[PDB]
Amino acid sequence: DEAEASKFVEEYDRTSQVVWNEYAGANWNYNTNITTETSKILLQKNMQIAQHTLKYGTQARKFDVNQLQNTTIKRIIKKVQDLERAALPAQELEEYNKILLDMETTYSVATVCHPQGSCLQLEPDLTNVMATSRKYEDLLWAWEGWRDKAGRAILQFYPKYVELINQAARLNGYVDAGDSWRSMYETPSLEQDLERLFQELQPLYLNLHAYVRRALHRHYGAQHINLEGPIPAHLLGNMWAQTWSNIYDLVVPFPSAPSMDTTEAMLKQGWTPRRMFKEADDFFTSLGLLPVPPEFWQKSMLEKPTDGREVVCHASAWDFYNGKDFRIKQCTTVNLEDLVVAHHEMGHIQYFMQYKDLPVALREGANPGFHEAIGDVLALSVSTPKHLHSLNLLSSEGGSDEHDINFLMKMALDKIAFIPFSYLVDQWRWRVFDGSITKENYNQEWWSLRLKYQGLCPPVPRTQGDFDPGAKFHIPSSVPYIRYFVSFIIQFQFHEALCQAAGHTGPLHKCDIYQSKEAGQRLATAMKLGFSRPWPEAMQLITGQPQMSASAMLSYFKPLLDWLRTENELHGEKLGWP
Numbered sequence: 001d002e003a004e005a006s007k008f009v010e011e012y013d014r015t016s017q018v019v020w021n022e023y024a025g026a027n028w029n030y031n032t033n034i035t036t037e038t039s040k041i042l043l044q045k046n047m048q049i050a051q052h053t054l055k056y057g058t059q060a061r062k063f064d065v066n067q068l069q070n071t072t073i074k075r076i077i078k079k080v081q082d083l084e085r086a087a088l089p090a091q092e093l094e095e096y097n098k099i100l101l102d103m104e105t106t107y108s109v110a111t112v113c114h115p116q117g118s119c120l121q122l123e124p125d126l127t128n129v130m131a132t133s134r135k136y137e138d139l140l141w142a143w144e145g146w147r148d149k150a151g152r153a154i155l156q157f158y159p160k161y162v163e164l165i166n167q168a169a170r171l172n173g174y175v176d177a178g179d180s181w182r183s184m185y186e187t188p189s190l191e192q193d194l195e196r197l198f199q200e201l202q203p204l205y206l207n208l209h210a211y212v213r214r215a216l217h218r219h220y221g222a223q224h225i226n227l228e229g230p231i232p233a234h235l236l237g238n239m240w241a242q243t244w245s246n247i248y249d250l251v252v253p254f255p256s257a258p259s260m261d262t263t264e265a266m267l268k269q270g271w272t273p274r275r276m277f278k279e280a281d282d283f284f285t286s287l288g289l290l291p292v293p294p295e296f297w298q299k300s301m302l303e304k305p306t307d308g309r310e311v312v313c314h315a316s317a318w319d320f321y322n323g324k325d326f327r328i329k330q331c332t333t334v335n336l337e338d339l340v341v342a343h344h345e346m347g348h349i350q351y352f353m354q355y356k357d358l359p360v361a362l363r364e365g366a367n368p369g370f371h372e373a374i375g376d377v378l379a380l381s382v383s384t385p386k387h388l389h390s391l392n393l394l395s396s397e398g399g400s401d402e403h404d405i406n407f408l409m410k411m412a413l414d415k416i417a418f419i420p421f422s423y424l425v426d427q428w429r430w431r432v433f434d435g436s437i438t439k440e441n442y443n444q445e446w447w448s449l450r451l452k453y454q455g456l457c458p459p460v461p462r463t464q465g466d467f468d469p470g471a472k473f474h475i476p477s478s479v480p481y482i483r484y485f486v487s488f489i490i491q492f493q494f495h496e497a498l499c500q501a502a503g504h505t506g507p508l509h510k511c512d513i514y515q516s517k518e519a520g521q522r523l524a525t526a527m528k529l530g531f532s533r534p535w536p537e538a539m540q541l542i543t544g545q546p547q548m549s550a551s552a553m554l555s556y557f558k559p560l561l562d563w564l565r566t567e568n569e570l571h572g573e574k575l576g577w578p
């Protein structure tokens with residue numbers, strides 16, 4: 001009966017608001033103050049939320065969704081039939097929650113120590129070494145040390161984690177946890193769709209890779225860079241070689257068109273983490289989107305605490321499931337990279353505020369990639385010379401073709417370099433979850449994919465005992481990654497569409513949507529849908545068509561593709577590696 005199903009959804013929504021708000025508070029208190037006591041309370045709230053999930057999920061499974069006529073009620077009930085970890089028997093649920101907490105804690109408190117010297121944390125210390133050192137051996141120490149201290153320490157937990165998350169997935173009707181995660185996109189063609197998008201980005205990536213490889217050969221020396229091989233993974237300015245923009249100074253296309261030191265400008269002008277988030281809030285409200293509430297400024301953790309607390313530094317945005325309390329937790333450093341991250345996080349908050357009035361089961365992005373994309377769209381405009389000049393962080397550039405290619409290169413070092421990384425993380429994990437990669441070859445298969453997709457090699461041979469995926473936050477934290485690949489494709493589709501909505505003409509990369517109410521209205525209409533409809537509808541509302549497409553990203557970077565081809569041809573580069 002339709003009436004029992006409607007009553008059930010109302011009861012689930014009321015009770016879920018209460019329980020999820022309590023869980024979120026305990027999880028926040030642990031993430032912002034890692035102690036034995038906050039850990040104990042969080043594990044207890046894990047059992048409370050599981051009790052609720054089991055009670056309502058068991059009832060949801062007694063409905064035959066095929067006979068429900070209302071499509072919204074049918075959709076909610078179907079989703080509530082997935083108990084996630086609460087499907088596990090009690091003993092295994094306890095073990096799984098403990099493993100998750102132990103992995104997170106281990107990653108978050110790991111340090112790398114000089115002999116009878118100082119000990120460095122990942123944020124900010126090791127991140128700063130990778131961004132700024134130009135000495136092969138110093139970069140190697142940080143890169144190898146982080147893997148030795150974080151990655152190795154996760155290995156003891158990972159096989160049992162895999163066993164238990166897969167067991168939960170099978171108890172929810174999937175074949176393994178990777179099947180469960182992929183299902184979040186409601187797109188049976190997902191694997192082939194993503195493969196086609198990756199292939200379309202290959203001209204740009206291969207050309208970028210060859211050009212950067214030549215520049216690294218010039219700086220690090222011919223004995224350390226093979227012009228026909230993969231690039232050593234510690235030289236790209238980033239711990240994971242996932243974004244390459246910190247080595248811009250080594251690869252500047254037109255050195256006769258120098259660009260301001262944006263970190264020094266932000267520091268000399270007294271920028272603080274609060275100013276960075278205030279700028280993001282202003283960009284959203286300039287589009288007619290919602291301001292964050294006063295409570296956000298009182299409750300958020302916008303910088304690393306100075307009082308000794310251990311915290312989870314990795315930037316994240318939090319919905320407390322009461323329609324009022326939204327927060328960001330980020331160990332913000334004052335630089336342009338973290339200004340972009342601040343916009344990324346503020347986009348999550350915007351999404352939370354836009355869909356706050358839907359049933360909690362529908363309070364998610366259209367798919368996980370849409371959630372990750374919103375803030376990045378605005379950050380594309382923040383990063384333009386027009387906007388940066390308005391913040392006093394760049395000198396006016398006028399229209400110089402040299403400054404234009406320089407700008408495109410800076411953007412490509414983040415956006416294009418990340419495409420193969422973001423593709424490969426879950427190619428690896430899906431094969432772990434399906435059993436085709438075992439603990440016998442975790443690390444070998446990781447490196448096989450780092451080579452295949454990114455064209456990188458480890459600077460030191462790996463040994464039994466190494467577990468380099470464990471040194472990347474999302475692995476021990478059990479956060480899916482393909483969302484970030486989807487995000488980087490679709491954020492350019494959204495930029496293109498919002499630029500058109502704002503009446504921009506001329507090259508896509510010159511567009512700045514600051515203050516466009518037309519652009520904001522497109523985004524708001526899609527975000528208000530939350531997860532109520534399959535994601536092609538939201539895609540259609542923003543862009544006027546329903547597919548994911550690399551055409552917008554390719555259009556944005558077309559001038560750079562042309563420049564890179566001419567430059568690599570002049571130097572005789574052989575694209576790719578064996």
Ligand SMILES: *[C@@H]1O[C@H](CO[C@@H]2O[C@@H](C)[C@@H](O)[C@@H](O)[C@@H]2O)[C@@H](O[C@@H]2O[C@H](CO)[C@@H](O[C@@H]3O[C@H](CO)[C@@H](O)[C@H](O[C@H]4O[C@H](CO)[C@@H](O)[C@H](O)[C@@H]4O)[C@@H]3O)[C@H](O)[C@H]2NC(C)=O)[C@H](O)[C@H]1NC(C)=O
Pocket residue numbers: 006007009010070071072073358359532
């Ligand atoms: C299938 O069922 C869904 C969900 O029903 C809702 O949840 C159930 C569990 C149960 O509690 C129901 O009683 C409950 O409605 C239906 O989707 C809802 O549809 C209604 C009617 O369209 C929407 O009501 C709207 O709510 C807005 C927020 O308060 C409000 O602004 C809207 O007013 C605006 O639009 C109206 C015209 O509709 C206009 O007169 C106003 O002046 C103003 O512009 C409006 O009242 C709910 O938001 C919907 N909820 C969800 C979650 O989608 C759905 O209609 C139903 N389908 C069928 C075919 O029956």
Ligand SMILES: NCCCC[C@H](NC(=O)[C@@H](S)Cc1ccccc1)C(=O)N[C@@H](Cc1c[nH]c2ccccc12)C(=O)O
Pocket residue numbers: 243314315316317340341344345348372376477479484
């Ligand atoms: N220095 C980067 C910090 C980015 C933090 C972001 N954070 C989440 O998405 C949180 S909101 C999700 C979460 C985390 C923990 C638990 C639950 C949910 C995140 O993870 N980006 C991915 C990809 C990425 C790298 N650079 C970026 C710059 C801008 C936008 C994205 C990226 C990553 O860092 O690899």
Ligand SMILES: *[C@@H]1O[C@H](CO)[C@@H](O)[C@H](O)[C@H]1NC(C)=O
Pocket residue numbers: 033035037038
């Ligand atoms: C950190 O947690 C401990 C243990 O629960 C508690 O006593 C202390 O007040 C907490 N500090 C903060 C700043 O939340």
Ligand SMILES: [Cl-]
Pocket residue numbers: 240468469
């Ligand atoms: Cl690695």
Ligand SMILES: [Cl-]
Pocket residue numbers: 181184368369480481482483484
């Ligand atoms: Cl995902």
Ligand SMILES: [Zn+2]
Pocket residue numbers: 344345348371372
């Ligand atoms: Zn995010």
